[PDB]
Paper text:
We also crystallized and determined the structures of the complexes formed by the FIP200 claw domain and the TNIP1_pS122 peptide. In the FIP200–TNIP1_pS122 complex, the FIP200 claw domain adopted a similar conformation to that in the FIP200–TNIP1_pS123 complex. Interestingly, the N-terminal region of the TNIP1_pS122 peptide formed a short helix, while the C-terminal region formed a short β-strand that interacted with the β4 of the claw domain. The phosphorylated S122 of TNIP1 peptide was exposed to the solvent and established two hydrogen bonds with TNIP1 S119 instead of forming direct hydrogen bond with K1569 in FIP200 claw domain, which might lead the binding affinity of FIP200 claw domain to the TNIP1_pS122 peptide weaker than the TNIP1_pS123 peptide. Molecular interaction patterns between the C-terminal region of TNIP1_pS122 and FIP200 claw domain closely resembled those observed with TNIP1_pS123. Phosphorylation on either S122 or S123 enhanced the binding affinity between the FIP200 claw domain and TNIP1 peptides.
Recent findings revealed that TNIP1 functions as a checkpoint mechanism that fine-tunes the rate of mitophagy by disrupting the recycling of the ULK complex during autophagosome formation. The phosphorylation of the TNIP1 FIR motif enhances its binding affinity for FIP200, enabling TNIP1 to compete with other autophagy receptors, such as CCPG1 or Optineurin. Here, we determined several crystal structures of the FIP200 claw domain in complex with phosphorylated TNIP1 FIR peptides and elucidated the specific recognition of different phosphorylated TNIP1 by FIP200 claw domain. Each FIP200 claw domain within the dimer features a five-stranded antiparallel β-sheet and a short α-helix.
Author numbering:
A (entry chain A): 1491 to 1543, 1550 to 1591
B (entry chain B): 100 to 109
Amino acid sequence: RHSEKIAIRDFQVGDLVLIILDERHDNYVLFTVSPTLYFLHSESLPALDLKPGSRRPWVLGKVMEKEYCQAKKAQNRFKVPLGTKFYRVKAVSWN
Amino acid sequence: SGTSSEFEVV
């Protein structure tokens, strides 16, 4: 409980993270002070009780994996330009 | 696919 504080950068396995809906990018992201987008991995949505697509505004999660990615087409599910680098993060519920 | 067309791991 004392170690339950939300990480804000350099996300590591085991970090507590605040996962928030980002309407502009049509996806859940991690709250961060990084300039880089950290998207929630699509495989993590069911176990966080989240849905694809009135979506729940936030959940608290625990980081399981991080993956560095780059958009290869101008039209993509993350609504970022061609060449944008971003992360995908797998997370499970903090509870 | 469409997904791996859109983005990749780097």
